[PDB]
Ligand binder design. Sequence first.
Ligand SMILES: CN(c1ncccc1CNc1nc(Nc2ccc3c(c2)CC(=O)N3)ncc1C(F)(F)F)S(C)(=O)=O
Length: 259
Amino acid sequence: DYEIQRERIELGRCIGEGQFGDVHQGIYMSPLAVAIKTCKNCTSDSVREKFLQEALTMRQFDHPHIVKLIGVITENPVWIIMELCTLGELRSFLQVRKYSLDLASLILYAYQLSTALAYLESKRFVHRDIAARNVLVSSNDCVKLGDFGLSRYLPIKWMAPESINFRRFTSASDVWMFGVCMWEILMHGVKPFQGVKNNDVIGRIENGERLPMPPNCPPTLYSLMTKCWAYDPSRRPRFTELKAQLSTILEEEKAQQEE
Ligand SMILES: CN(c1ncccc1CNc1nc(Nc2ccc3c(c2)CC(=O)N3)ncc1C(F)(F)F)S(C)(=O)=O
């Protein structure tokens, strides 16, 4: 049973705004730090059903680098109780720690995300919304994919060409996005294609242009990014291959950092 008695939740401060309402952090007293998605207008049942469907989606998954559903509260106000990633949003985390976070750590986050994404592919689940904005930090040695409902955006600057042109969404278009997500992490939480109109993004990609090597990014890691950005989706690596390749790059950097 995933139904939670409300008296066991103490609601804390607001940590962001969802499609349905504010998200709070708080504490769960079970017989635990949590996030609480709330729902402004769940007095209506059409809204309520959509909201609560987002819980069932997260219930399907069990991975150390995807946020866990703890439970739900299904009378008004209707809440979904999720695992809290204490340290918050990745982009902010990365910006604030731009000059204090080692490269091995940045690569670690890439690797961890790739294990979750390889896991989702093996569940035959296409995500569509892989971006640093949708990653969260549990601690400084652990990132996780955020809530999938909260992740829902068109994010042209992240999307694969075939997604843009023909609305093709496959694990291979997810790979393209993850490449952009990796670029973002190594760029310390800078968005891709800033100062570029969404429309010119497509033409540039067609012209052969890709996002540039982030400063201090290992060329091996950047190369791996550019393979995610093969125009032909069949020619991109599988998430399981990125996982293996990211492990070797992680271990190489750890050895360079003498650890
Ligand atoms: C960025 N995301 C959000 N989009 C919209 C509203 C809220 C969130 C954040 N959601 C979460 N956030 C956290 N941790 C967290 C965050 C933000 C701060 C803090 C903690 C402390 C703080 O100051 N800000 N832990 C769990 C969750 C979750 F997904 F399980 F519900 S996403 C799409 O869920 O990745």
